[PDB]
């Protein structure tokens, strides 16, 4: 139950999470909108990512 990035995304607020196509994640909170609070498997950094930009492994 841990998603992967489909497209690259550069965040522009301190609370979003930036990532490169292929960076793996792990959702900490999807139940709140189409902006999921996720945790980067690569860095360990948490923050909101646009759910429409990711998909399950």
């Amino acid at each position: 139950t841990l998603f992967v990035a489909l497209y690259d995304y550069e965040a522009r607020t301190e609370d979003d999470l930036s990532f490169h196509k292929g960076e793996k994640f792990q959702i900490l909170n999807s139940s709140e909108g189409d902006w999921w609070e996720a945790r980067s498997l690569t860095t360990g950094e948490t923050g909101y990512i646009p759910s429409n930009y990711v998909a399950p492994v």
Partner: protein
């Protein structure tokens, strides 16, 4: 590149975004027009996803203070207006000390 989900503008989001457009430079000093205010709302909306109902300044004449606490930009006549950065807006809800109706 898909277009990110919708989400409401927020104080913290507004602040980070202001420093961003200030760091980048350009919006500062730029002459105002609805066509620009509108291209703005859309550029932010496309890239960030913030629903386009946050960049509202107050009614003139004079200085146009932003309604969204945290958007550190105002409109100053230099009527012909122009965008001006002023970090005090991040600490004073002037557009509410003046026009409380909107809140």
């Amino acid at each position: 590149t898909p277009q990110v989900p919708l989400r409401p503008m927020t104080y913290k989001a507004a602040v980070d975004l202001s420093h961003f457009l200030k760091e980048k430079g350009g919006l500062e000093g730029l002459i105002h027009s609805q066509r620009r205010q509108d291209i703005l709302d859309l550029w932010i909306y496309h890239t960030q996803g913030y629903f386009p109902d946050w960049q509202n300044y107050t009614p003139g004449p004079g200085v146009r203070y932003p309604l969204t606490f945290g958007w550190c930009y105002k409109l100053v006549p230099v009527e012909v207006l122009e965008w001006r950065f002023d970090s005090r807006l991040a600490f004073h809800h002037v557009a509410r000390e003046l026009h409380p109706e909107y809140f």
